[PDB]
Amino acid sequence: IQLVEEELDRAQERLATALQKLEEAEKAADESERGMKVIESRAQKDEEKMEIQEIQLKEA
Amino acid sequence: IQLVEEELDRAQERLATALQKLEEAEKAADESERGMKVIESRAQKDEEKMEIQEIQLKEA
Amino acid sequence: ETTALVCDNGSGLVKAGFAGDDAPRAVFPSIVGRPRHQGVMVGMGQKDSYVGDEAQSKRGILTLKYPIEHGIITNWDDMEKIWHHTFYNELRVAPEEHPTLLTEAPLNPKANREKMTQIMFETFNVPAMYVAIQAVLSLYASGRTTGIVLDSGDGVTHNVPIYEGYALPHAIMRLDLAGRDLTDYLMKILTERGYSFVTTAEREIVRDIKEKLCYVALDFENEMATAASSSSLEKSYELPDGQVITIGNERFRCPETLFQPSFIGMESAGIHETTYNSIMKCDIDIRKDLYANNVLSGGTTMYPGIADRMQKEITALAPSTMKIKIIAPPERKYSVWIGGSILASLSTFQQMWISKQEYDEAGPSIVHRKCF
């Protein structure tokens, strides 16, 4: 029993540690995703404005 | 015996699965960051081009 | 072609690997542990020197020392241990087959540049080597010949105006205050809250906390007010022995010392101020390409929300007809090492290396003829 119990306890501790590291990697992934979305929105705005200027520049 | 053994085994099955999931979460964070890098580098190149154009237009 | 080891001399993290790759292949703590007591291990072998992650696992029984304190090599013996470990444990390769690129601060002491040149060549028997300013590599990683880099490491902050690949020697600015100091400061201000930390092992948890939970406020008074008016500027952290601690305003206060050096009793000016003063030493036709490329670099710059703060601060000091814009690389913590990986894999750069013959002729001095 005991040997098996010591193996199970070790198994459990390892599972907890993996789940915390996993929750962190998910959070970091969620954050990359948020970061990315603001950046995409800026990218669109800078492009339109660089293009808008291309018309105005041609006109000047 | 049986209960401690079954609990161990599933605990390992679960651990294995949590490591697999950690690699997957890691991969996905990388795919997001890379994509995030590509948009970011496109946003920046457009910006540098935009500011040169706001100035070229003012200068003109 | 000869595979070059690029070894970033970071002051709280070593970053190491091979040139031509897009990222470091070893990232471990800059820590040498040596025994507080001998007799600890009985029935197992004892060693007296642990380095990096090996040291980290054994922290309880080890005295940790930093090889590099405030970007300055402070112990040649601990720098050597880091190196021995880099080559033989971490990358598991003979250094004597692989040219070496070393990273440095601007104004890194000449007696130090030499002891580094000598130690690499005599003991490790390197075939060739080079030494390069951290910010110049981060600018090459940003794809640019010209720009000003704010490089803030795990121990020093520099503002480095660079032009056609050369750092401008009259215009560069330095501040000893960054990641090393930041931990010691964080620890102080937590004792003040009544979460006394007096042990150095606990200090390393405080280090980890700092990296995870610190954030740069966009407005220091408004966030300070928010924390005084509401407890919504606090994040919990569970210590690994249990015990849930609450980290408050310390989150933004800790890095606040970078903008206001007086908080720790200095006569120094802030990181934004020394950015502005550094560009104002440069000529007007290059102020254009310098201001147009304000680059963030190093471990201390990885706190979220830094760009909006730095954008603010610099536009307030600088005239509103320079283009102002913060460039923050996707993985700015590594941009020195990535810049070294780029530089050491350029076909034009292979003419620049210090050879073993030039070292045999001129001694450790040769770095001051080959490096600029």
Residue numbers in the entry:
A (entry chain G), B (entry chain H): 92 to 151
C (entry chain I): 6 to 377
Paper quotes:
Muscle contraction requires a shortening of the sarcomere, the basic contractile unit of muscle, caused by the sliding of interdigitating thick and thin filaments. Here we present the molecular architecture of native cardiac sarcomeres in the relaxed state, determined by cryo-electron tomography. To obtain a near-native sample suitable for focused-ion-beam milling and cryo-ET analysis, we relaxed demembranated mouse cardiac myofibrils in the presence of EGTA, dextran and mavacamten. Our cryo-ET structure of the sarcomere in the relaxed state together with our previously determined structures of the sarcomere in the rigor state provide insights into muscle architecture and its molecular complexity, intricacy of regulation and sophistication.
The tomograms showed that the thick filaments were indeed in the OFF state, as defined by the absence of myosin binding to thin filaments. Using subtomogram averaging, we could determine the structure of the cardiac thin filament with tropomyosin in the blocked state (myosin-binding site occluded) at 8.2 Å resolution and the structure of the relaxed thick filament. We observed the presence of several cMyBP-C links in the C zone, suggesting that the N-terminal region can indeed interact with the thin filament. Despite our efforts, subtomogram averaging did not resolve any clear arrangement of the N-terminal region on the thin filament, indicating a high heterogeneity in these interactions, in agreement with previous reconstructions from isolated components. Our segmentation exposed the presence of a tether formed by 3 to 4 domains that blend in the signal of the thin filament with 43-nm intervals and high degrees of flexibility. Thus, the flexibility of the links can probably accomodate the mismatch of the 37-nm actin repeat in thin filaments and the 43-nm cMyBP-C repeat in thick filaments. Of note, the thin filament with bound N-terminal cMyBP-C domains appears in the OFF state, suggesting that cMyBP-C, at physiological phosphorylation levels and in the absence of myosin cross-bridges, is not a thin filament activator.
